[PDB]
Each structure stands twice: as structure tokens, then as C-alpha cells.
Amino acid sequence: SHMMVSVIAKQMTYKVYMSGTVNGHYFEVEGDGKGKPYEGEQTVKLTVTKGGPLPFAWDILSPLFSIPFTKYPEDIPDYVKQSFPEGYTWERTMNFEDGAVCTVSNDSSIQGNCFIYNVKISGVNFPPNGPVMQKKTQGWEPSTERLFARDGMLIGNDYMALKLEGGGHYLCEFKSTYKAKKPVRMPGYHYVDRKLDVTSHNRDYTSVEQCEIAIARHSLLG
Amino acid sequence: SHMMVSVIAKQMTYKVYMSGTVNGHYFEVEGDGKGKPYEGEQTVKLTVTKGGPLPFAWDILSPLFSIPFTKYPEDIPDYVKQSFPEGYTWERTMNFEDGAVCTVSNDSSIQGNCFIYNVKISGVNFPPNGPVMQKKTQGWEPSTERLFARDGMLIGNDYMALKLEGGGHYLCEFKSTYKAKKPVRMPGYHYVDRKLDVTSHNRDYTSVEQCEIAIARHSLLG
Amino acid sequence: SHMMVSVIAKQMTYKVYMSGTVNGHYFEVEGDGKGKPYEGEQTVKLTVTKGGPLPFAWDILSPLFSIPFTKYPEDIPDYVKQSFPEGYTWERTMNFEDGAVCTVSNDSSIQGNCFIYNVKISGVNFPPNGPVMQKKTQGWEPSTERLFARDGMLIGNDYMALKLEGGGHYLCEFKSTYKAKKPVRMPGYHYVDRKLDVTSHNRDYTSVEQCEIAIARHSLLG
Amino acid sequence: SHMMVSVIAKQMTYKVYMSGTVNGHYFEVEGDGKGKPYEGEQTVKLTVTKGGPLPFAWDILSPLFSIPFTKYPEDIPDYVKQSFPEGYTWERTMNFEDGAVCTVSNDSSIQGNCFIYNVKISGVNFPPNGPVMQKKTQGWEPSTERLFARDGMLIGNDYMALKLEGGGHYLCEFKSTYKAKKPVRMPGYHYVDRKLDVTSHNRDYTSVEQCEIAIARHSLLG
Structure with a gap:
């Protein structure tokens, strides 16, 4: 009784396009990705x-x-x-x-077996001797996103933690708003457990590979 | 498992004294509790x-x-x-x-197999037509606190939500600091799942019964 | 055409009562004050x-x-x-x-020539080696409070700055809500320039004297 | 007074290029300015x-x-x-x-008696029935930025407000970081008063004229 949708194959690839500016530095990143939508890998x-x-x-x-x-x-x-x-x-x-x-800001369409993601980021007021600018970060902790529906949109908050060189953590609040381009069946209050890891990286992080697992769940109690 | 500790029984009680002002209204509340500390009930x-x-x-x-x-x-x-x-x-x-x-703020101390809790609360800028002042809330969704160690203190954040009358959710954001009165062993980044329900209540909530499950865990994905 | 109100004399005294808890420390402060309401001193x-x-x-x-x-x-x-x-x-x-x-939270009444102020403060999550707990503060900077009316209330925001031992500043956001106990003539968007100084203080700050000047104004431009 | 500087005239011009995405809508805007820099006009x-x-x-x-x-x-x-x-x-x-x-973000450089400004803006989570998306705003109240020096940067905060149709105010909160590309003399805690008006505009605001006064000052009380 778990139902797949005919437009999303059990194995799909995607292409990501990303322009951004962080502390006034402009940069473009391109990416090719592949995974199993209904398995969240x-x-x-x-x-x-x-x-x-x-x-x-x-x-x-x-x-x-x-x-x-x-x-x-x-x-x-x-x-x-x-x-x-x-x-x-x-x-x-x-x-x-x-x-x-x-x-x-992210827009997402589909082209046969392939998802197209366009993404812009604007990042400001990053302490010049902080872990982000001194590159003292060491990957994300596994997160749980609270999600609910409001005005036919899906709101998501997540308390996240970057691991720091020399132990300790650098905290971040995520607030996400998802808007479907078409009326869909709205879900209730639920959770998405996520783990993101950077798997491979050359020395100047110009070529990077990362893997994510994303599982949606109910309350684990009751 | 559960590393049991000789000072805390498998079955314990507590006396909670609470004083507080919310929207300028002063109130005092006393309570008697009981639970299975190594089971989280x-x-x-x-x-x-x-x-x-x-x-x-x-x-x-x-x-x-x-x-x-x-x-x-x-x-x-x-x-x-x-x-x-x-x-x-x-x-x-x-x-x-x-x-x-x-x-x-809260101060905790033990007395045999009885826990002592003193807790003061200050609450302000609660909208007079909002859900709290209009008493239209219907209990807390199950939540997941994110705790980690910093300067010998345990720091938890959690994104909570009160169920509302006529559907919908009234979002709250919790930020706690836990400070032991005696050097203890620090935990790594970890999570606590909680479900908390008002089980029974008189007509003006001057007598209330609540029950809580609370379980620590690692990432469910690693 | 500047009008005084007959209940407030050109010279009035006041009495302040203050209970509070900061980082779990309970304290009571009492105070006797005097000034010129229509001159803001x-x-x-x-x-x-x-x-x-x-x-x-x-x-x-x-x-x-x-x-x-x-x-x-x-x-x-x-x-x-x-x-x-x-x-x-x-x-x-x-x-x-x-x-x-x-x-x-503050309630204010009058008793002939005298204002009565009751005040509670609850202060939490003060970094244990921060300027507030290490007593590295050196008085407030002069502030301007933006004020406007909403729902027959007066809202006030003020960006404030504590001066620090060794130069530099420790920032604070003020958000104030004033509720008259009686319908009054609401004002428009306006500013209150304020300067607070601690004038005298014994060594353990158990006996302190401070003076304030508070001036309400329009936009200085146009 | 005004400590005039030989590189900046008493009468100067500027060319502003702006690109930006607000609510996913991409737009570019070019502009030609002129003013009396040592007078703030x-x-x-x-x-x-x-x-x-x-x-x-x-x-x-x-x-x-x-x-x-x-x-x-x-x-x-x-x-x-x-x-x-x-x-x-x-x-x-x-x-x-x-x-x-x-x-x-903004990048400023001079070219004779012409200032060059490049400015990118990212704007998100603008309510679709809110005042900005419904175009019910009627210009900015006069404001007062609070600037101070920190790690060789100038840090300004200001509590702003957009005038609304049918009375009322839509509150905004500004936080700016100013970074010179060359060691300069640092100022003390000080204030900037500003008034900014849209003087003229076509019917769809694809041509707009704005005028700004801006004056630095010490505390008006000390």
C-alpha cells in the first residue's frame, strides 16, 4: 500500500545549478547527482x-x-x-x-529520468575570524526537521550543528518553506531525520562529493 | 542499556514548587511526582x-x-x-x-528517594487574542531536543508546537542550559525524544495530571 | 500651549520595589527617586x-x-x-x-506627590565568562527609542550598547510594551532620546545612585 | 564642521548597478545619482x-x-x-x-568625481498577502542608525518602519557591516539621522527618483 508516482523512477539522476555570493565573493557551482527517491539515498x-x-x-x-x-x-x-x-x-x-x-531560493523541474535544480545563496555578516571563514568546520551533525502544512505550504525548522576543528560545535537555525507548483494532498506534523556526509574532496574543495540519507517518520513515542 | 547509579532508585518521587508571573498575573503551583528514572517514565x-x-x-x-x-x-x-x-x-x-x-530558572536537589524542584517562570507580551490568553491550545506535539556540551554546561535546543483548536499549530522555540553543581562526564552531540500529555484536569485546571516519556538516543542513521 | 496634568506636579518623588532572579540568583532592590516629569530629569x-x-x-x-x-x-x-x-x-x-x-514586568500607580513602581526581572543564559557575569560593563550609551501605537498600546524598540572594560561594546535589543490602565489620546511615530549614568556607587554596588534625562522628539530632519 | 578630503569633491555623482532576486523574481536596476557629500544631500x-x-x-x-x-x-x-x-x-x-x-552585499569604488556601486539583494519568505507583495507600503519613516567600531569594521543597527495604507506601520530591523579596503581611523559610538523619500515615479515604478538627507551626530544630551 506504499505508492510510487510514475514520473519518479526508483533510480533517478539530477543536475544542480548554483550561483551565490558569500561575504561579497561571487561563485558558481555545478553538480551531477543520482539516487533512489523512494529509499531516500x-x-x-x-x-x-x-x-x-x-x-x-x-x-x-x-x-x-x-x-x-x-x-x-x-x-x-x-x-x-x-x-x-x-x-x-x-x-x-x-x-x-x-x-x-x-x-x-530554489526552483525544481523534471526532464524525463532527470531533476533540474537551480539554487541561489546570499550569505552576509560572517565573522572574519569565525569557523566558516577560517575553514574550521568538520561536517554537519545528523538533523531532524520538524515539518507541518500552512496555507498549502510545507514549513520546516531544523536546529543544526557544524562540528569544529578542536571539538565543540557551531550552531545554526534552518527555516525552510516548500511551495508545490500544483495542489497536492497536505501531510500532518511529521519529522525528517537526515545525515549528510562529504565523502570525497580534493584539497581546495573545487571538486567535492557528498552523500545524504533522508527518512520521514512519525513521533517515535506513542 | 542503562548505567544505573546507587543514589537514584529504579523508582523515585519528586516535589515540585513553582512560582511565576505570566502577563503580570502572579501564581504559585505545587506538585507531587513519581517515575522510573532509568526507563524515562x-x-x-x-x-x-x-x-x-x-x-x-x-x-x-x-x-x-x-x-x-x-x-x-x-x-x-x-x-x-x-x-x-x-x-x-x-x-x-x-x-x-x-x-x-x-x-x-530551576534548582534541583535530592532527599533520600525524593527529588526537590524549585522553578520560577516569567512570561510577557502574550497577545490578548492569541491562543494562550484565549485558552485555545490542545497540548504539545512530541518533540526531539538536541543536546551538546559547552563550557561544562549541556545546551539543548528544540523546535516545539502546541496543537490548536480548529486544526493548526502555534510554534514555540525552546533553548535550555543544564548546569550540574559538581564536575561530571560530558556527553557527545545526542538527541532526546519526548512525549508529554495532560492526562486529567478539573474544570479550571487548578488540579492537573501530566505524564512524560523521555528517551536519549544516537542518530537513527549513524 | 504645552499642557501639564494636575495629578503630576512639576516636582514629584517616586518609590521603586524590585524582585528579580538572574542566572538563578534571587535579589530584592528598593529605591527612592525624585525629579521633574515635564522637564524629563x-x-x-x-x-x-x-x-x-x-x-x-x-x-x-x-x-x-x-x-x-x-x-x-x-x-x-x-x-x-x-x-x-x-x-x-x-x-x-x-x-x-x-x-x-x-x-x-512593571505596574505603576500614584499616591499624592509619589509614584509607586513594582518591577520583576527574570534573566537567563548569561555566559559565565561574559561581560555581565565578569562585571566588565562600564555604563550604557545614550539611546533613542522608536515608539508608535498599536491596539491602544505603545510599542518601543531601542538598540542599546553597554561600554566594555578595555574599550568595545556589548549590544542589547530592547522591546517595550506600555499599556495605559485608561483610554488616552494615542501619539504617532516619535523618538525618545535618553541618557542614563550611574552617579555614585559603594564598592559592592549594594547602594547605587543613577540620574536619567529623557526627551521625546519628532524626526530631526524635515 | 566637516574635515574635507581632496579625493571627494563638494559635488559628486554616482552610477549604481543592482541585481537581485526577491520571492524568486529576478530583476536588474541601474541608476545615476548626484549630491553634496560633505552636506549629506x-x-x-x-x-x-x-x-x-x-x-x-x-x-x-x-x-x-x-x-x-x-x-x-x-x-x-x-x-x-x-x-x-x-x-x-x-x-x-x-x-x-x-x-x-x-x-x-555592496562593492564601492571611485572614478574621478563618479562613485561606482554594485549591489546584489536576496529576499525570501515575503507573505503573499503581506504589505510588500500587496504593494500597500507608503515609504520609510525617518530613522537613526547606531554605528560603532569592531575588529576594524563599522557596525550599524537601526529599527526602521514602513508607513502603510489605512494608517499603521510595517516594522523592519536593519543590521549593516561597513568594511573599508584600507586601514582608516575608527570612530566612537555615534548616530546617523536619515530621511529618504521617493520624490517621483512612473505608474509601474520602472522609473523612480529618490532623495536622501543623512547627518552624523553625537548624543543630543552628551
């Missing part, structure tokens, strides 16, 4: 095409490179997958504890 | 001693009434349980989406 | 009656010790003064940049 | 080059179109004016009360 190779090498931590960009690769159980409506073939948009604001702010 | 009966009946939704008080009762797996250092016999303190900020703010 | 002697000596900076409490001592020009309605003889309430939230939060 | 005519007409209130763009044109008294070190001939950069966060966020 994905991987993507990223090439920095313009503005490399990047003067900030890679870890601030990693969470902007693929939402349809979430495992939804049979009793929870998959808002994102239901939106295809037309697609979805999302906007995101990331708030770090040293005062830095990022705004993100 | 507990009920508690409250009585509003002074300022009953209360002009705000019981639900804004519900999460200030018992942290020892948290099932920690043996591979996670149990910060609060090591803090005893001496005791611990915690401070909290409860920031609601409609501009309400609450500040909470 | 005041002074008050503060005695710490309980919980002294205080383990935190004095400068976090100073801005909670007298609003009717503001100079309003003839063309701007004085919301606060118009509320007497019955009085006003106000709630305040102070947000420091090291993450600390304070909530404040 | 300037007009500028804008033309929307790409993405005209704009689906949001002009007023959210109005404050991203010229910091050299600020009357500094001789007793205040004029951070931006010392930064030239090289140039300066600034980053800004514009946080609105209804959850909207904008991020802005």
Missing part, C-alpha cells in the same frame, strides 16, 4: 565552475545541493513527490550563532 | 496554590514540571544523573512565534 | 535589600528603575502622563548578543 | 533594466541605492570617506516583523 559530485577556490567553509553550501530523495512511509503524504511533474520551489534562511545569515 | 499531579484560576493555557506551564526521568543508553554519559546527589540547575527561554517570551 | 538612590552583593553587572538592572519623567513637546501626546491617576503597566524583553535574555 | 534616478515591472513594493529596494553622502562633524572620524580612493564594502540583513528576510 542520494549522492552528487560538485564542481566549482567560477569563483573557486572558495574563501569560506564548504559546510555552509552542502545543505543546498535534493528533497525528492526522501523515504516517506505509506501513512504520510509525500508533498514533494506529489508535486511532479511540474515541480516545487523552496526558500530557506540559515541563522548561525556568530550572527551570520544566509537566504536561499 | 513519570506522572505528576499539580495543584495551583495561589492565583488560581489561571488566565492562560495550562500548556505553557506543562514543560516546566523533571529531567532525571530520561532513559539514557549506557554508551551516552547521563549528565543530569551524574550531577546527583548534589543537584543541577537549568535555565530556559521559550520564544513563541506571535512574539510571546518566557524565561525559566 | 530624574535621580534615584537604590539599596539592595536581599541577595546582595549581586554576582552580575549593575548595568543590566539600571534601565528598569521611571517613564513619566520624560519631556514631551506640545505637539506630541504624552501617553504615559495622560494615563494617571490610575497608571500604566509595561513588559520588556532585553536580548544581548552573547544569547542572554531578560523579561521584565 | 543626494538624489538618484533609477530605471528597472530587467524583470520590470516588479511584483513587490518599491520601498524594500529604496534603502540599497549611497553612504559617502553623510554630513560628518569634524570631531567624528568619517570611516567611509577615509576608505577612498580605494573603496568600501557593506553587507546588510533586513529582518521584517512578518518573517520576511533580505540579505544585501
Whole structure:
């Protein structure tokens, strides 16, 4: 009784296009990714095409490179997958504890076996001797995103933690808004457990590979 | 597993004394609890001693009434349980989406097989037609606190939500600091799942019963 | 055509009562003050009656010790003064940049020549080696409060700056809500320039004297 | 007074190029300005080059179109004016009360008696029935930025407000970082008063004229 949608194959690839500006530095990143949407497992190779090498931590960009690769159980409506073939948009604001702010905008369509993601990031007020600019980050902690529906949109908040060179953590608030381009069956209050890891990286992070697992769940208690 | 500690029984009680001002209204509340600390289970009966009946939704008080009762797996250092016999303190900020703010301090100490909790709460800028002042809230969704160690303190953040009448959600944002009165072993980044329900109540919530499950865990994906 | 109100003499005294808790430390402060309401000049002697000596900076409490001592020009309605003889309430939230939060609640009545102020403060999550707890503060900078009316209330935001031992500043956001206990003539968008200085202080800040000047104005341009 | 500087005339011009995405809508805007830098006076005519007409209130763009044109008294070190001939950069966060966020970066350089400004803006989570998306805003109230020196950067915060149709105010909160490309003399805690008006506009705001006064000052009370 767990139902797949005919536009999303059990194995799909995607292409990501990303322009951005962080502390006034402009950069373009391109990426090819592949995974199993209904199993919530994905991987993507990223090439920095313009503005490399990047003067900030890679870890601030990693969470902007693929939402349809979430495992939804049979009793929870998959808002994102239901939106295809037309697609979805999302906007995101990331708030770090040293005062830095990022705004993100993403549009997503499909072209046969392939997802197209366009993504812009604008990041400002990054402490010049902070972990992001001194590249003292060491990958994300596994997160749980709270999600609910409001005005036919899907809101998501996530308290995240960048691991720091020399132990300790650098905190960040995620607030996500997902807008389907087509009326879909809205889900209730639910959670997405996520783990993102950077798997391979050359020395100047101009060529990076990362893998994500994304599982949607109910309350684990009751 | 659960690394049991000789000072805290498998079956314990607690006495909670709470005083507080919300929207200028002063109130005092006393309570008697009981639970299985190494299993993360507990009920508690409250009585509003002074300022009953209360002009705000019981639900804004519900999460200030018992942290020892948290099932920690043996591979996670149990910060609060090591803090005893001496005791611990915690401070909290409860920031609601409609501009309400609450500040909470607590002082915990043990007496045989009885826990002692003193807790003061200050709450302001609660909209007079909002859900809390109009008493239209219907209890807390299950949540997942993110705790980590910093300067010998345990820092938790959680993105909460009050269920509302006629569907919908009233978003709250919790930020807690836990401070043991005695050097203890620090835990790594880890999570606590919680479900908290008002089981019984009189007609003006001057007598209330609540029950809490609370289980520590690692990432469900790694 | 600048109009005084018969309940507020050109010279008035006041009495302040303040209970509070900061980083879990309880304290009571009492104060006698005197000034010229229509000239916006005041002074008050503060005695710490309980919980002294205080383990935190004095400068976090100073801005909670007298609003009717503001100079309003003839063309701007004085919301606060118009509320007497019955009085006003106000709630305040102070947000420091090291993450600390304070909530404040104040009720104000009049008794002949004398204003009575009751004030509670709850302050939490103050970094233990931050300027407030290490007492590295050196008085407030002069502030301008933006003020406007909403729902027959007066909202006030102020970006403030504590001066630091060794130069540099420790920032704080003020958000104030004033509620008259009686319908008054609402004012428009306007500014209150304020300067608070601590004038005298014994060595343990158990006996402190401070003076404030508070001037309400229009836009200085146009 | 005004400590004049040989690189910046008493009468100067500027060319502003702006690109930006607000609510996923991409737009480009070019402009020609002129003003009396040591008097703090300037007009500028804008033309929307790409993405005209704009689906949001002009007023959210109005404050991203010229910091050299600020009357500094001789007793205040004029951070931006010392930064030239090289140039300066600034980053800004514009946080609105209804959850909207904008991020802005700018790069400034001089060319004879012409200033060059490049400015990108990212804006997200703008409510579709809110005042900006419904174009019900009617220009900015006069404001007062609070600037101070930190790690060789100038940090300004200001509490702003957009005038609304049918009375009322739509609150915004500005946080700017100013960074000169060349060691300059740092100013003390000081204030900037500003008034900014849309003087003229076509019917779809694809041609707009704005005028700005901007005067630095010490505390008006000390």
C-alpha cells in the first residue's frame, strides 16, 4: 500500500545549478547527482565552475545541493513527490550563532529520468575570524526537521550543528518553506531525520562529493 | 542499556514548587511526582496554590514540571544523573512565534528517594487574542531536543508546537542550559525524544495530571 | 500651549520595589527617586535589600528603575502622563548578543506627590565568562527609542550598547510594551532620546545612585 | 564642521548597478545619482533594466541605492570617506516583523568625481498577502542608525518602519557591516539621522527618483 508516482523512477539522476555570493565573493557551482527517491539515498559530485577556490567553509553550501530523495512511509503524504511533474520551489534562511545569515531560493523541474535544480545563496555578516571563514568546520551533525502544512505550504525548522576543528560545535537555525507548483494532498506534523556526509574532496574543495540519507517518520513515542 | 547509579532508585518521587508571573498575573503551583528514572517514565499531579484560576493555557506551564526521568543508553554519559546527589540547575527561554517570551530558572536537589524542584517562570507580551490568553491550545506535539556540551554546561535546543483548536499549530522555540553543581562526564552531540500529555484536569485546571516519556538516543542513521 | 496634568506636579518623588532572579540568583532592590516629569530629569538612590552583593553587572538592572519623567513637546501626546491617576503597566524583553535574555514586568500607580513602581526581572543564559557575569560593563550609551501605537498600546524598540572594560561594546535589543490602565489620546511615530549614568556607587554596588534625562522628539530632519 | 578630503569633491555623482532576486523574481536596476557629500544631500534616478515591472513594493529596494553622502562633524572620524580612493564594502540583513528576510552585499569604488556601486539583494519568505507583495507600503519613516567600531569594521543597527495604507506601520530591523579596503581611523559610538523619500515615479515604478538627507551626530544630551 506504499505508492510510487510514475514520473519518479526508483533510480533517478539530477543536475544542480548554483550561483551565490558569500561575504561579497561571487561563485558558481555545478553538480551531477543520482539516487533512489523512494529509499531516500542520494549522492552528487560538485564542481566549482567560477569563483573557486572558495574563501569560506564548504559546510555552509552542502545543505543546498535534493528533497525528492526522501523515504516517506505509506501513512504520510509525500508533498514533494506529489508535486511532479511540474515541480516545487523552496526558500530557506540559515541563522548561525556568530550572527551570520544566509537566504536561499530554489526552483525544481523534471526532464524525463532527470531533476533540474537551480539554487541561489546570499550569505552576509560572517565573522572574519569565525569557523566558516577560517575553514574550521568538520561536517554537519545528523538533523531532524520538524515539518507541518500552512496555507498549502510545507514549513520546516531544523536546529543544526557544524562540528569544529578542536571539538565543540557551531550552531545554526534552518527555516525552510516548500511551495508545490500544483495542489497536492497536505501531510500532518511529521519529522525528517537526515545525515549528510562529504565523502570525497580534493584539497581546495573545487571538486567535492557528498552523500545524504533522508527518512520521514512519525513521533517515535506513542 | 542503562548505567544505573546507587543514589537514584529504579523508582523515585519528586516535589515540585513553582512560582511565576505570566502577563503580570502572579501564581504559585505545587506538585507531587513519581517515575522510573532509568526507563524515562513519570506522572505528576499539580495543584495551583495561589492565583488560581489561571488566565492562560495550562500548556505553557506543562514543560516546566523533571529531567532525571530520561532513559539514557549506557554508551551516552547521563549528565543530569551524574550531577546527583548534589543537584543541577537549568535555565530556559521559550520564544513563541506571535512574539510571546518566557524565561525559566530551576534548582534541583535530592532527599533520600525524593527529588526537590524549585522553578520560577516569567512570561510577557502574550497577545490578548492569541491562543494562550484565549485558552485555545490542545497540548504539545512530541518533540526531539538536541543536546551538546559547552563550557561544562549541556545546551539543548528544540523546535516545539502546541496543537490548536480548529486544526493548526502555534510554534514555540525552546533553548535550555543544564548546569550540574559538581564536575561530571560530558556527553557527545545526542538527541532526546519526548512525549508529554495532560492526562486529567478539573474544570479550571487548578488540579492537573501530566505524564512524560523521555528517551536519549544516537542518530537513527549513524 | 504645552499642557501639564494636575495629578503630576512639576516636582514629584517616586518609590521603586524590585524582585528579580538572574542566572538563578534571587535579589530584592528598593529605591527612592525624585525629579521633574515635564522637564524629563530624574535621580534615584537604590539599596539592595536581599541577595546582595549581586554576582552580575549593575548595568543590566539600571534601565528598569521611571517613564513619566520624560519631556514631551506640545505637539506630541504624552501617553504615559495622560494615563494617571490610575497608571500604566509595561513588559520588556532585553536580548544581548552573547544569547542572554531578560523579561521584565512593571505596574505603576500614584499616591499624592509619589509614584509607586513594582518591577520583576527574570534573566537567563548569561555566559559565565561574559561581560555581565565578569562585571566588565562600564555604563550604557545614550539611546533613542522608536515608539508608535498599536491596539491602544505603545510599542518601543531601542538598540542599546553597554561600554566594555578595555574599550568595545556589548549590544542589547530592547522591546517595550506600555499599556495605559485608561483610554488616552494615542501619539504617532516619535523618538525618545535618553541618557542614563550611574552617579555614585559603594564598592559592592549594594547602594547605587543613577540620574536619567529623557526627551521625546519628532524626526530631526524635515 | 566637516574635515574635507581632496579625493571627494563638494559635488559628486554616482552610477549604481543592482541585481537581485526577491520571492524568486529576478530583476536588474541601474541608476545615476548626484549630491553634496560633505552636506549629506543626494538624489538618484533609477530605471528597472530587467524583470520590470516588479511584483513587490518599491520601498524594500529604496534603502540599497549611497553612504559617502553623510554630513560628518569634524570631531567624528568619517570611516567611509577615509576608505577612498580605494573603496568600501557593506553587507546588510533586513529582518521584517512578518518573517520576511533580505540579505544585501555592496562593492564601492571611485572614478574621478563618479562613485561606482554594485549591489546584489536576496529576499525570501515575503507573505503573499503581506504589505510588500500587496504593494500597500507608503515609504520609510525617518530613522537613526547606531554605528560603532569592531575588529576594524563599522557596525550599524537601526529599527526602521514602513508607513502603510489605512494608517499603521510595517516594522523592519536593519543590521549593516561597513568594511573599508584600507586601514582608516575608527570612530566612537555615534548616530546617523536619515530621511529618504521617493520624490517621483512612473505608474509601474520602472522609473523612480529618490532623495536622501543623512547627518552624523553625537548624543543630543552628551
